[PDB]
Structure formats: C-alpha cells, structure tokens
From a paper:
Anionic calixarenes are useful mediators of protein assembly.
Cocrystals of 100–200 µm dimension and diverse morphology grew within hours to days in a broad range of conditions. The Gly33 carbonyl group is within hydrogen bond distance of four phenols, while Val13 forms CH−π interactions with a single phenolphosphonate. Lys34 is a linchpin residue (115 Å2 buried) entrapped by a phenolphosphonate pair. Structural differences in the interchangeable linkers result in different relative orientations of the protein nodes in the two structures, yielding different crystal symmetries.
Numbering used by the authors: 1 to 90
The structure:
C-alpha cells in the first residue's frame, strides 16, 4: 500500500537520486546541493532498486523496475534513460 523507494548517491556534495514507486509509476527526485527537483526518469513498476557508479566524473545509474515477475533495467549514462540488457534467470 505504501510507496516504495530506492536511493543512491555519489561524490561529496553529494548528488542524491531517490526513486519512488507509487501506484505503478516510478518517478525520480534529485539533489545536487541546491534543492530537490524532479528528474527525467518515469517508468512503470511496483518495486524499484538502484545502483550507480562513477567513471571519473561521469555518473552511471541502473534502475531495476519490477511488475509481476518481470524486471526491466533502465540505464542512465549521461544522455537519456535507455533500456538495458538485464534479463532474469527466466
Ligand atoms: O540533472 C538531472 C538528471 O539529468 O541527472 C541524471 C539523472 O538522474 C536524470 O534522470 C536527471 O534528470
Ligand atoms: O550500457 C548499458 C549496459 O550494457 O550497461 C551494463 C549493464 O547494465 C547492461 O545490462 C546494460 O545493457
């Protein structure tokens, strides 16, 4: 019933991203040190997890969005959210 969240952060400022699954939709709130704002991520799902890593100064984010038994990976690599190659054990 309650919304479900996932969070990641990078750097020392820091940057933070919080993903919320609410009524089948996952949205994103962002912090880079100057206030919270709404990010570009919008994808369907009831459950969400996230991980991220830096390559130098560039952030890479992977969001795992689940509905039923299907998990979709979404990828941020600097230029829009793209569907990743992740598949389950099937
Ligand atoms: O600067 C904000 C932004 O580009 O940061 C990287 C990702 O979190 C995006 O969804 C988000 O819109
Ligand atoms: O560049 C995207 C990608 O190759 O990044 C590593 C993994 O997240 C993969 O599933 C994904 O397709």
């Amino acid at each position: 019933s309650s919304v479900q969240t996932a969070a990641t952060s990078w750097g020392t400022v820091p940057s933070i991203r919080v993903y919320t699954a609410n009524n089948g939709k996952i949205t994103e709130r962002c912090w880079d040190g100057k206030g919270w704002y709404t990010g570009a991520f919008n994808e369907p799902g009831d459950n969400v997890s996230v991980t991220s890593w830096l390559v130098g100064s560039a952030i890479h984010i992977r969001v795992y969005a689940s509905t039923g038994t299907t998990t979709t990976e979404w990828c941020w690599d600097g230029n829009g959210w793209t569907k990743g190659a992740y598949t389950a054990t099937n």
